[PDB]
Amino acid sequence: MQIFVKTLTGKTITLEVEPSDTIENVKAKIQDKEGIPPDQQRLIFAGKQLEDGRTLSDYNIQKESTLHLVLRLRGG
Amino acid sequence: SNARRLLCVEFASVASCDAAVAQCFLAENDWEMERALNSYFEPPV
Ligand SMILES: [K+]
Ligand SMILES: [Mg+2]
Ligand SMILES: [Mg+2]
């Protein structure tokens, strides 16, 4: 199935996933696409930050869902 | 400002929160949206 990840830097990332994908798996797919290290990534769905170890199915994330990507910042 | 109102809309979309809450997180983070969202998702512990 397809889900979308919207970044705050103007990209919508189109991913292929399964309900059984873990959040870590999704972050790895984002790294594949955009080069963003997983440790920087905060993935958000329906206003909540998604936790490593859970799956998309744990969060009831269905086909064509949009997730948001917020990056952790350094230097501030 | 128009620009700040747009930031509030975007913050509230990501956080799925009320506009007033978004505005205060933004203002308290110097109107820096990614910083404000980091604060929102990892508050003081
Ligand atoms: K929320
Ligand atoms: Mg497929
Ligand atoms: Mg890779």
Of A70, A73, A76, which has the smallest distance from its Cβ to B14's Cβ? A70
Q: How far from each other are the two terminal CA atoms of chain A, in whole angstroms?
A: 38
A12 part of contact set with chain B, CB < 8 Å: no
- The full set of domain ranges for chain B reads 1-45
Distance B32 CA to ligand 1 centre (A): 18
Give Dmax (Cα) for chain A.
38
Closest CA to A17 of A6, A8, A5: A5
CA of residue B5 relative to chain centroid, distance = 11
Are B37 and A73 within 8 A, CB to CB?
no
By CB atoms closer than 10 A (0-12, 13-18, 19+), residue B36 is buried
Q: Of B24, B2, B37, B13, which is closest to residue A76 (Cα–Cα)?
A: B37
CB B16 within 8 A of CB B1: no
Amino acid at A71: L
Give the method of determination.
X-ray
Look at A47 and B37 and tell me if their CB atoms are within 8 Å. Answer: no
Interchain contact, A49 vs B41, CB within 8 Å: yes
Query: What resolution in angstroms, rounded to 1 decimal?
Result: 0.9
DSSP tag of B42: S
- Kindly tell me the sign of the dihedral angle through the C-alpha atoms of B31, B34, B35, B39: positive
CATH fold for domain A2-71 = Ubiquitin-like (UB roll) (3.10.20)
What are the angstrom distances between the C-alpha of A76 and each of A33, A35, A71? 27, 22, 13
Q: Which two tokens stand for residue A35?
A: 């080069």
